[PDB]
Subunit: 111 residues, 4 copies
């Protein structure tokens, strides 16, 4: 139900081993977290049972990622905050593209 | 020293009258050119994209666009209903 | 060796049935073309045998796509032009994100 | 009526002295603020991103950024070595 995919615009590659923290609005309660794979993807964050309606924030730790590659980051993280499952359960993929001074995110939502 | 600019990728225009709150702090609403001047460590710029889309009658994915960075800075955000990108020019 | 993936930022979905034309620099010679799947992906454009070094242009037909959905497009197409395989064969994925008045593309290149 | 603006997403700055050729037509190189004024159906704006990156000592993926559209227009391009995004504001 919640997938994150991250690409690196500086290296021309997936963004590998990037930390992703998901929080749910209670204050922001920790909900789920993970690290992207060698494909830049993070599956297994959560389950249909755990993924309730509410306001979720996904924070992708772009600062650590760039610092580990030896690159100066501008942002602390790339984030996405969205209301989930309000009219019914859905599946969300958050796709992100990273550069040191810019990031882009989009959502794909399926029923 | 800190400017915010907001653009609409659907209609190809500035995003007018968008609420922008800066934390660490400053706030405003965007002008007819999509810019917010005169707002004024680690800063958060929270752009009320949900109200912008809903005024247009478009269902948007995000609650807001929040951009968090360490500190003359221009923070631009390009909006679509299910995406946003943001840039810093310094 | 050459994959294209396309997402729609207006609908929150893959960009389905979008035409993609690839040309190689001779004038631009037709090289390969296809349409994205229900996942927004286009596999099977070309083969390791056919994919030689050279300058390639990938043109994604964003105008037809938006017109078919009833949306006014600004661009004629989203394009990407790049030198391929110069220091050796590689695999290229071109990922694109579409809005009516904007598009983004990135490349993932693997050996 | 037609402005071009080019920004660098790696260094967080305008892209200075970039060659831009418009077809249908006009050409120029970007200024210290990354803008090209005074350039002046279907138009192509070809931005020489490869020369920009190679002057910085960075190997870039694209040959150029070419943006083709049907026609006051601002065409912005945000550059990274393996990506570019482009916006039209009208
Ligand atoms: O289909 C995909 O895997 C995929 C497609 C496009 C992106 C993408 C492109 C540009 C900006 N942001 C995200 C990311 C992933
Ligand atoms: O200053 C501007 O006009 C301007 C600033 C930023 C962008 C932009 C942002 C994200 C992706 N692509 C382009 C575009 C234009
Ligand atoms: Ca509900
Ligand atoms: Ca060679």
């Amino acid at each position: 139900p919640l997938m994150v995919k991250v690409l690196d615009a500086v290296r021309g590659s997936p963004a590998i081993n990037v930390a992703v923290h998901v929080f749910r609005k209670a204050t922001w309660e920790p909900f789920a977290s993970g690290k992207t794979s060698e494909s830049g993807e993070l599956h297994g964050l959560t389950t249909e049972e755990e993924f309730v309606e509410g306001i979720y924030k996904v924070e992708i730790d772009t600062k650590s990622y760039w610092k580990a590659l030896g690159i100066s980051p501008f942002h602390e993280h790339a984030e996405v905050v969205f209301t989930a499952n309000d009219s019914g359960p859905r599946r969300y993929t958050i796709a992100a593209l990273l550069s040191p001074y810019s990031y882009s995110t989009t959502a794909v939502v399926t029923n």
